[PDB]
Amino acid sequence: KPRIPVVWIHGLECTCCTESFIRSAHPLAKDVILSLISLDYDDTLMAAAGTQAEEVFEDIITQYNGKYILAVEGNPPLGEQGMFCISSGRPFIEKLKRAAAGASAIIAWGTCASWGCVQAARPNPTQATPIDKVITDKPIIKVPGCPPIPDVMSAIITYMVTFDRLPDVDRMGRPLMFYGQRIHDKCYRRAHFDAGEFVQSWDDDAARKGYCLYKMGCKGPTTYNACSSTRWNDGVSFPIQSGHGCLGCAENGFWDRGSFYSR
Amino acid sequence: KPRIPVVWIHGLECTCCTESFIRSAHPLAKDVILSLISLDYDDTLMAAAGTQAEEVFEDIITQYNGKYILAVEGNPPLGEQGMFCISSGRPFIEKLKRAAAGASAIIAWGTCASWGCVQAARPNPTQATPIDKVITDKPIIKVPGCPPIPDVMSAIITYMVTFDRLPDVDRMGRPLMFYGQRIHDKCYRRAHFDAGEFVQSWDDDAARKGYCLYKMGCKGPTTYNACSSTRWNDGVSFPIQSGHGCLGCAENGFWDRGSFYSR
Amino acid sequence: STQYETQGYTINNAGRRLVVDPITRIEGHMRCEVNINDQNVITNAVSCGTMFRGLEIILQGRDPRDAWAFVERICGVCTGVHALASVYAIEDAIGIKVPDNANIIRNIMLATLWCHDHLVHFYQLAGMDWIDVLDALKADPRKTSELAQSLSSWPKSSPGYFFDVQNRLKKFVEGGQLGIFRNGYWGHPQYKLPPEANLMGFAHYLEALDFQREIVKIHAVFGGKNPHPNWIVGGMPCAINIDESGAVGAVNMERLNLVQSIITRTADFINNVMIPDALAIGQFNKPWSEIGTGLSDKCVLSYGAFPDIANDFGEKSLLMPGGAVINGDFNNVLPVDLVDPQQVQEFVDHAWYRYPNDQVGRHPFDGITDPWYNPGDVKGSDTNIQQLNEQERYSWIKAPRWRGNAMEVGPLARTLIAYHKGDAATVESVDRMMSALNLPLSGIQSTLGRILCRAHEAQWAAGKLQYFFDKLMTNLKNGNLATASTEKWEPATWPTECRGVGFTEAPRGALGHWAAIRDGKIDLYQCVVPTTWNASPRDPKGQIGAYEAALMNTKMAIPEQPLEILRTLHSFDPCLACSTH
Amino acid sequence: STQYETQGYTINNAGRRLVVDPITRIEGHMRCEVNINDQNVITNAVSCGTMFRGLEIILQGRDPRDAWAFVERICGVCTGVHALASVYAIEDAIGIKVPDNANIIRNIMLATLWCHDHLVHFYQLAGMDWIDVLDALKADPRKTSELAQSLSSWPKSSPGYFFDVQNRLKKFVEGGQLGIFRNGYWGHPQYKLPPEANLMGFAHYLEALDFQREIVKIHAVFGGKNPHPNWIVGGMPCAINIDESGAVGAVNMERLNLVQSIITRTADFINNVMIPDALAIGQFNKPWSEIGTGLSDKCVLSYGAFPDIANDFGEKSLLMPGGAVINGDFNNVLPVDLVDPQQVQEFVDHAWYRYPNDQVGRHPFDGITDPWYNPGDVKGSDTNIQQLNEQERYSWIKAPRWRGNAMEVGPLARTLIAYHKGDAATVESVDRMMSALNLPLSGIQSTLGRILCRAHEAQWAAGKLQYFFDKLMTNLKNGNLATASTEKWEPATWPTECRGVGFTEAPRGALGHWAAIRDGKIDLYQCVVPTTWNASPRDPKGQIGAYEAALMNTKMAIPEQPLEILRTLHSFDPCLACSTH
Numbered sequence A, B: 001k002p003r004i005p006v007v008w009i010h011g012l013e014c015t016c017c018t019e020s021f022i023r024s025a026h027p028l029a030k031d032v033i034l035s036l037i038s039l040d041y042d043d044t045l046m047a048a049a050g051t052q053a054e055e056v057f058e059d060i061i062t063q064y065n066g067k068y069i070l071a072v073e074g075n076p077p078l079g080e081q082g083m084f085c086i087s088s089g090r091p092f093i094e095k096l097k098r099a100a101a102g103a104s105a106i107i108a109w110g111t112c113a114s115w116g117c118v119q120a121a122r123p124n125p126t127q128a129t130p131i132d133k134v135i136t137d138k139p140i141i142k143v144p145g146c147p148p149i150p151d152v153m154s155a156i157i158t159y160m161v162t163f164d165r166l167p168d169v170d171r172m173g174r175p176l177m178f179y180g181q182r183i184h185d186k187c188y189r190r191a192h193f194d195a196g197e198f199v200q201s202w203d204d205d206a207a208r209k210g211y212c213l214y215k216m217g218c219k220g221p222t223t224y225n226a227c228s229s230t231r232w233n234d235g236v237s238f239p240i241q242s243g244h245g246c247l248g249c250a251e252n253g254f255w256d257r258g259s260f261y262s263r
Numbered sequence C, D: 001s002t003q004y005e006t007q008g009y010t011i012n013n014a015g016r017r018l019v020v021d022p023i024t025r026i027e028g029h030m031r032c033e034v035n036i037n038d039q040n041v042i043t044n045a046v047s048c049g050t051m052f053r054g055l056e057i058i059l060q061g062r063d064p065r066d067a068w069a070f071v072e073r074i075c076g077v078c079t080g081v082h083a084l085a086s087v088y089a090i091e092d093a094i095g096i097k098v099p100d101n102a103n104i105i106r107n108i109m110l111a112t113l114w115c116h117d118h119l120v121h122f123y124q125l126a127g128m129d130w131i132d133v134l135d136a137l138k139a140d141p142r143k144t145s146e147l148a149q150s151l152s153s154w155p156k157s158s159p160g161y162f163f164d165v166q167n168r169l170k171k172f173v174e175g176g177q178l179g180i181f182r183n184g185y186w187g188h189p190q191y192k193l194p195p196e197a198n199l200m201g202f203a204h205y206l207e208a209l210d211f212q213r214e215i216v217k218i219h220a221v222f223g224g225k226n227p228h229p230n231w232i233v234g235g236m237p238c239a240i241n242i243d244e245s246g247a248v249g250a251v252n253m254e255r256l257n258l259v260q261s262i263i264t265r266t267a268d269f270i271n272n273v274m275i276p277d278a279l280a281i282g283q284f285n286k287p288w289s290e291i292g293t294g295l296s297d298k299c300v301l302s303y304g305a306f307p308d309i310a311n312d313f314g315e316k317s318l319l320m321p322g323g324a325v326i327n328g329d330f331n332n333v334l335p336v337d338l339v340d341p342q343q344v345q346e347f348v349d350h351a352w353y354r355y356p357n358d359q360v361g362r363h364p365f366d367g368i369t370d371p372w373y374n375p376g377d378v379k380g381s382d383t384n385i386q387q388l389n390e391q392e393r394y395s396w397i398k399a400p401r402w403r404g405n406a407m408e409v410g411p412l413a414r415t416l417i418a419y420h421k422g423d424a425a426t427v428e429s430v431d432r433m434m435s436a437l438n439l440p441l442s443g444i445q446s447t448l449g450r451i452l453c454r455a456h457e458a459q460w461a462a463g464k465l466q467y468f469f470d471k472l473m474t475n476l477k478n479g480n481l482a483t484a485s486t487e488k489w490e491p492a493t494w495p496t497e498c499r500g501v502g503f504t505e506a507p508r509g510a511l512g513h514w515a516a517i518r519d520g521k522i523d524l525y526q527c528v529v530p531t532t533w534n535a536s537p538r539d540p541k542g543q544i545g546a547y548e549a550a551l552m553n554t555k556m557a558i559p560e561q562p563l564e565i566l567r568t569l570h571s572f573d574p575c576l577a578c579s580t581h
């Protein structure tokens, strides 16, 4: 029984989103690849390089025109005619647009594809631009975070495959299932926040008791993600649980909302 | 190098505490048994029965007199001259007393050994009695819960072996490390509690969004345990995360504090 | 000394008495006494539950909605099954119908428990009766690898693995701290595995000890924790949200994915580790296909379980069949009615309880739990028992009967009922298993057969887990998310007076909870639990229960070493806290 | 076409030009061009980084305490190593000393990264260059089991296992949906493993894909999450509480038990799966001990890493040695100083950057990151590079040199430095490894050698994880819990103007961050990263970097299928986002 074709492309990136994906605990990334999808193109993992990789890209988008999911990791830079990100000697944006035209839907992985992330932070030397500002005629599911939670990535894939539909989304295109509520709306340190029980300097007595990280700059109160509920790395931890405030890493422009340690 | 002798006895019980222990994810119970302790007597797991088991009991408490940890699961009944719980044709309490006399320290596993648990709930037909009301001359570390969290149990053992000392306790003899704070002091639904956002009937819209369980009877506000932080079964869940209020199961007398669904 | 005839046995208490107290590698507290003749053959067997707590008394006056939480603590081994019977009973009393997803999830909770419980029983409780652990030290790791590879596709079979496991055991015993292995029966002539099979089995003991912790993650997702997950009257509290805001606060796609992953791993472990080990024990111990038959060729009982049609407990719904066989007539599987006062009755003439008339049985709606510790004319005294007096009261366990007949319950009983009702899957499984052993179908009616059927059932339950998961996902794809019915949650909505029965098949057999509600409170709550059946003392007719029958006529190689008694008792998977409650 | 001599090579751009763009199974974006002569031997090699983001620009005006979070996103593969360098650099500038446990935990973070990164590189990135995945479909599962068992004690070796893996691969490919295996180099004559070795390798590919997820749980405990854990200037934020109220809110005994469990499993996987697989690749591909030497017999560089004495970055403290060798003189390992302006310099005469004088190299404290996309004539257009012009600017990667020498960095470099400094563990490991392969020491200076050294480093790091964990636990037993120094957290305590260097050994080689602070903000932040060294373009003297050199003189069997190029490039583990930042 045929698996749904997925084309996974990479713009300006650090590869944290592919790395997060392979961390998936349930389903294992192994089983996603072998049983749930047909991961037909993916620079980081695929055997073919160069002309062999170009042949795969061209064949898949042609053969499965209108029928593949396009996963995008990273983003296109508009600076230097797009040649801050070069693929087969040409601007990355050309491949983005070619792949987008044939896709049934697009997943914008991470803060990079969703919003811009670190390369888009002031002064944005490359004019890094999120996917939805370039591709304007396709369904785009934003799955933000730097990177998103591994089991959130795999859960979204499983939903799309199993239910044969896109996740319902908020007004910004984020799946309601995992981005409907704030970190601070499900944080296990809220008792401390409500009591005015705060860490005031690192490794103080408050810190050693798991007090709230608000005064240490936690951006949980303005950040939508699943970290405080689903947690990270098979439920082992999340930023706040290990003693650092939320950076705000799932939110548009988080790098430029001031010091991580200020209000 | 020799491993620390442990004698694990069983009074009136449901065996939930043994079951919890073998769930340990880190260290695995396998590794606890093979490498960290010498589990020298334990009715539920030992090969020997009858006179062979009695010989083990006698030999261990004699050869390692003053040098074994006694773990107690369950509790002694004072009714019917103790013959509500019979071992080797005599009241269980006689084995408890003999085991206690030779122990360096005693771990009261679970709400049974700590407080009484379900058999001590009104009208306590057997006069089931917690260990510290019978043994008054030995250190007793209470590890309550019905049962306690698997990885709490194993962490307490690893503490005792690694650090060569008993955990520091509160005024009730519970290890501060895991019982110093309330469920409600580290509950990820506190945001909802603080906002007055409550489940009011099962499977209502509030329930489907993970609202606070206070109006459904949650006893987290008066219950000391690690469930909302450490969580259960290798971090998978805890009562409240799966939609049921805390019963108060780590607290003395929790069965008789009123309906689990009432304030 | 006396002698009488019952159920084809000659019960003779002349001659040497042997006592096994405590029975180990069970749940809870049991004592067993036998008499053996000059030929070292058991001519009398006495089953004694040596604990009591009184949940039926404790439940009086409580809110019916709380009852599941109390009765769950009947047992931490069969954890959950009493909660399930409780919510079934209260729903039956009040007239509550739960949503399909709640029923499916309850079926998942029960199947999960079957898998977990059976697996732990096989390795940690019964295993050391069949596997000589110290003999594993003598095995050849390469021949161990070859054996394992001849029996199974399971990956973990390298010579180096078996060598490492063997060296771990060697190190473990090197300091003279043998722990759970100390003063065992090692070297007894009834240990028949070759050294390589002992090392294989011991490796698997350790693998199962590790792996069992994973299975109960399913309980943690739907029920918060294991042991002792949470439930509600009206369904389950684990509200579902797949595609809406706040799914992070509910059973969502990520939580369901975790469940799927555990199901697949559970099936794989059972099918490729436990199943081949059960068959291997069979191959090396075929004489035990003719030992410990007891009541299993005469009277067996199942209530049935796993209703596939929500709130329908009839024959067309239950995936695990119900029925009773008596008089060895397996051609006549009889229907069971738990309201009929002439069917299930409990006697206490040989138990530590008071009845107005101890020569008659009482149906649980007329049940009485009035403890009376009265061991009478024992050898010794009431606080120092050398020998129970089986001619009078000798147990905390009541004596259940079905239409006056003494019945065996549990995996063998169920297998027989399903087989003889013509369940295609059970017939195929049993026939293939007995063909592989070159044994007749009658060979399942035995101590070995109880173990084989238990392993079979773990495989069956693992399959059903996937079936139930798929059914749940089908509903969610159709936008059917409901997990609770609350229209009768409030006590004011209940009948002023009503009664109900909650029944299922626990790992160890037929379970029933009988509840009467009056004026919003529990008026009566009586439990009859599978080990109550199997470990039953005698009745006014002198009829013996399943354990006593299975122990009758057993040869012992060494009277002082109860290996054969342990083998047969452990084959029934005794749960003594369950039996007594 | 032109020809010139440099570093013993004849750089000749006559003959057929081959382009490989994109390079896959790397991190990020790379293009490679070569020229081959009439004997299909490479006579020219061109390394091109095809991405830029400009972190050095973005970091200007940030708070120094925030810098680690920004620069961590230079790379998601070597996740955390830039955060470590950053906190080191800021601490070095301000004059902050962290508590011992912070340093130990930072070492744990780095060792965990080494283990994870090296494992994934071996299997998921380089592996398919050596393992013919499709040829595994021709393997005998029993012969596969026999092979695996001859090489390793690893448990998962059964014939059934290998048959099940093969069948999974068969079903995967049967519909034509080959996914990541589509249009690969399968059947190329340089694939030398027998089918059984291909099936063993493939199975381990899948095992490593699963297992790698577990390793990073250590980063989740100490760092909150992986990828991209959290850190602080002054230590780590993961406050410790073992024995006091509220330990549920901190790193407690249960958290540490989790870490220990991961360490043991990580060592076992690396030692019994990766190590034997690396030796097997060696045994079947011995000719690759003589291919891709490049600069590894001329110039190698390590800064050193893993300071064992907290806040001491000297030779007596660093557990991973630093040093430089030039001109093939391994008898004189030279000391490296990252402040010395005559040592590390970067050139941009062949890169897409502006300097006031592009004929001189700038030390990073004098560094300039002024992007200038200027490819000149590339036989197409500015937006259509058909052939890079390696006589002018051809890369987004700057050209680092050490005292004007082109250097190789990474596992091979480090092994050679440690070996020739006389590190006993390294000498013994290397000697034994090359003995086992029946190759001379010189065989390590090769494409095969880079792979062997990387595997051996994974083993080293797994050992060091336990050492560091034990060191942590020793402090906790002595009541030393501190994880942060905050004396100089507040900007009012900092020097008005200061600068600092943070350095370490990332999985791919020598890493440095150079930071200048003024008035509480970052004035300058310059990174030189390992792949910057290795993937370097040319300098004003025409000297070639490690990649270009290693590709020089390489035979290609089939010019259109660049398997040899991929093998050598992948052996260096290219991280292009790192290289360009």
Ligand SMILES: O=C(O)CN(CC(=O)O)c1ccccc1OCCOc1ccccc1N(CC(=O)O)CC(=O)O
Binding pocket: C141, C142, C159, C160, C163, D149, D150, D151, D152, D153
């Ligand atoms: O080798 C060990 O570490 C343990 N030994 C010791 C021993 O062979 O006597 C062992 C003992 C019993 C069963 C299996 C064993 O080993 C399995 C892994 O074996 C090897 C691993 C690496 C390299 C060569 C081998 N060998 C393969 C071979 O045992 O069949 C041969 C060897 O040990 O030299």
Ligand SMILES: O=C(O)CN(CC(=O)O)c1ccccc1OCCOc1ccccc1N(CC(=O)O)CC(=O)O
Binding pocket: C149, C150, C151, C152, C153, D141, D142, D159, D160, D163
């Ligand atoms: O049996 C299977 O399920 C798969 N087969 C088929 C086949 O062996 O040809 C297989 C193929 C290739 C390698 C290993 C294999 O199986 C290993 C598990 O093997 C058995 C399991 C149970 C009972 C008997 C065996 N056999 C042992 C034996 O194959 O060495 C033989 C058998 O399959 O009858």
Ligand code: SF4
Binding pocket: A183, A184, A187, A188, A189, A190, A191, A193, A211, A212, A213, A214, A218, A219, A220, A221, A240, A245, A246
């Ligand atoms: S730690 Fe952050 S998210 Fe949690 S309660 Fe405090 S401010 Fe809110």
Ligand code: SF4
Binding pocket: B183, B184, B187, B188, B189, B190, B191, B193, B211, B212, B213, B214, B218, B219, B220, B221, B240, B245, B246
């Ligand atoms: S669910 Fe219970 S413990 Fe959590 S916030 Fe509400 S009342 Fe407190």
Ligand code: FCO
Binding pocket: C075, C078, C081, C082, C506, C507, C508, C509, C511, C529, C530, C531, C532, C574, C575, C578, C579
């Ligand atoms: N299984 C089980 Fe427990 C018993 N006997 C119950 O019900």
Ligand code: FCO
Binding pocket: D075, D078, D081, D082, D506, D507, D508, D509, D511, D529, D530, D531, D532, D574, D575, D578, D579
């Ligand atoms: N390893 C690594 Fe990344 C590169 N190159 C860094 O630093």
Ligand code: SF3
Binding pocket: A013, A014, A015, A016, A017, A018, A073, A074, A109, A110, A111, A112, A113, A117, A118, A145, A146, A147, D073, D076
């Ligand atoms: Fe996730 S590739 Fe890493 S930078 Fe922030 S998402 Fe991007």
Ligand code: SF3
Binding pocket: B013, B014, B015, B016, B017, B018, B073, B074, B109, B110, B111, B112, B113, B117, B118, B145, B146, B147, C073, C076
């Ligand atoms: Fe835990 S044996 Fe189970 S009842 Fe409550 S602790 Fe007791």
Ligand code: F3S
Binding pocket: A145, A146, A183, A223, A224, A225, A227, A228, A238, A239, A240, A245, A246, A247, A248, A249, A250, D225
């Ligand atoms: S920093 Fe990111 S990972 Fe979660 S806790 Fe905050 S959204």
Ligand code: F3S
Binding pocket: B145, B146, B183, B223, B224, B225, B227, B228, B238, B239, B240, B245, B246, B247, B248, B249, B250, C225
């Ligand atoms: S019921 Fe018990 S298990 Fe924890 S959440 Fe409440 S203390």
Ligand SMILES: [Cl-]
Binding pocket: A111, A115, A116, A117, A118, A120, A251, A252, A253, A254, A255
């Ligand atoms: Cl952004």
Ligand SMILES: [Cl-]
Binding pocket: B111, B115, B116, B117, B118, B120, B251, B252, B253, B254, B255
């Ligand atoms: Cl209590």
Ligand SMILES: [Cl-]
Binding pocket: B169, B170, B171, B172
């Ligand atoms: Cl206190």
Ligand SMILES: [Cl-]
Binding pocket: A056, A059, D182, D183
């Ligand atoms: Cl293709």
Ligand SMILES: [Eu+2]
Binding pocket: none
């Ligand atoms: Eu060997």
Ligand SMILES: [Eu+2]
Binding pocket: none
């Ligand atoms: Eu076979």
